[PDB]
Design a protein around this nucleic acid. Structure first.
Ligand SMILES: [Zn+2]
Ligand SMILES: [Zn+2]
Lengths: 309, 69
RNA sequence: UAUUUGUAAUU
């Protein structure tokens, strides 16, 4: 048959897989069941294929769901092995949106307590996020219960912060609440971290108002210190935008009382000027005019930089 | 592009702006005006040159340092 | 004259 491989190379291979993709929309269902029945044998090895996985992905939709289930069973028993594998996990995450929610729940029950070494993989985190988006949050209570004591240590993790945002965006109140309090504990250190600022930033533009009130109250006193910091400056940015008029006024009045030269540190420093800019376009004309008449002289120190204000 | 920005912000003639790019292909500083400038804080120059506002040792200033000065 | 404006894991 390899003689026909070199008789078609003269005109699992990218040509054959992508032509399968562009002609799977045609042909007969008898050929569909033909190939599917020709794969059901040992698909456990066909998952970890660089371009067989394109084919598996493409067929997880155009076929009758019977093939989705019958091939679904030819996977369980080896999920902890195929979840870390690159192409296997592309197959998985591209397959969790086509099967039935029951088989989905079977997959969720396949891995419990493993979360530790799962998101701590280059491939496990993507699948975890895909499941937090797909699977019902109530079935993922093992995630919320696998993080007791593990919230602060993994919220600063690069693969961890993504999963944290996915949990906070696709869950109920009972699931988002305990992790949210775990975040309210270590806030002052999370902001300083390169990935805690993604988490807090995601909170300020998604969560309930009350969390934003708590966090804003846990900042009043660190405006110049964090606007001068590298990552925290974004927290200040996306913090002054999403706020009530009363909190905007509170922080604005907390800034305009800076010791003059502190305003010079604001305008000069490589980060605080963003805080100034995004602070301009949220305030009411009352506090806006009370800030125009406050740092107007320092303006005469930005015409040499790149600020056309 | 093939042009720098540092020389553009300092209003150098239009040929100097388009003469060099801001940095190297290896994040080495390339603009000769910036490579000349020795950092008054961290002392570095040339490949790792930078101005004061962007110095890695530019200290974080609290409200206390704003009261005492 | 010190002047460039600033963050995220895979086919
Ligand atoms: Zn230059
Ligand atoms: Zn320096």
């Amino acid at each position: 048959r390899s003689r026909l491989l070199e008789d078609f190379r003269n005109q699992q291979d990218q040509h054959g897989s992508r032509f399968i993709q562009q002609k799977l929309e045609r042909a007969t269902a008898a050929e569909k069941q033909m190939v599917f029945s020709e794969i059901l044998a040992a698909a456990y090895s066909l998952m970890t294929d660089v371009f067989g996985n394109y084919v598996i992905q493409k067929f997880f939709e155009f076929g009758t769901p019977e093939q989705k289930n019958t091939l679904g069973m030819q996977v369980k028993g080896h999920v902890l092995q195929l979840a870390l594998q690159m192409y296997g996990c592309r197959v998985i995450q591209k397959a969790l949106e086509s099967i039935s929610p029951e088989q989905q729940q079977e997959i969720v029950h396949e891995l419990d307590g493993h979360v530790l070494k799962c998101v701590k993989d280059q491939n496990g985190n993507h699948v975890v996020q895909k499941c937090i988006e797909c699977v019902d949050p109530v079935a993922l209570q093992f995630i919320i219960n696998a993080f007791k004591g593990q919230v602060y240590s993994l919220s600063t993790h690069p693969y961890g912060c993504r999963v944290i945002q996915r949990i906070l965006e696709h869950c109920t109140a009972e699931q988002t609440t305990p992790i949210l309090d775990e975040l309210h504990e270590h806030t002052e250190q999370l902001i300083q971290d390169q990935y805690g600022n993604y988490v807090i930033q995601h909170v300020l533009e998604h969560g309930k108002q009350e969390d934003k009130s708590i966090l804003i109250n846990s900042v009043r006193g660190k405006v110049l210190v964090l606007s001068q910091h590298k990552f925290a400056s974004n927290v200040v940015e996306k913090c002054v935008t999403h706020a009530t008029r009363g909190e905007r006024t509170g922080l604005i009045d907390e800034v305009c009382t800076f010791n003059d030269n502190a305003l010079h540190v604001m305008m000069k420093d490589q980060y605080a000027n963003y805080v100034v800019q995004k602070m301009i376009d949220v305030s009411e004309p009352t506090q806006l005019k009370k800030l125009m008449t406050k740092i107007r002289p320092h303006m005469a120190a930005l015409r040499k930089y790149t600020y056309g204000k | 592009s093939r042009h720098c920005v540092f020389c553009e912000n300092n209003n150098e003639p239009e040929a100097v702006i388009n003469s060099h790019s801001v940095r190297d292909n290896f994040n080495r500083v390339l603009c000769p005006k910036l490579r000349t400038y020795v950092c008054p804080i961290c002392g570095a120059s040339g490949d790792s040159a930078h101005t004061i506002k962007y110095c890695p040792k530019k200290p974080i200033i609290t409200m206390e340092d704003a009261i005492k000065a």
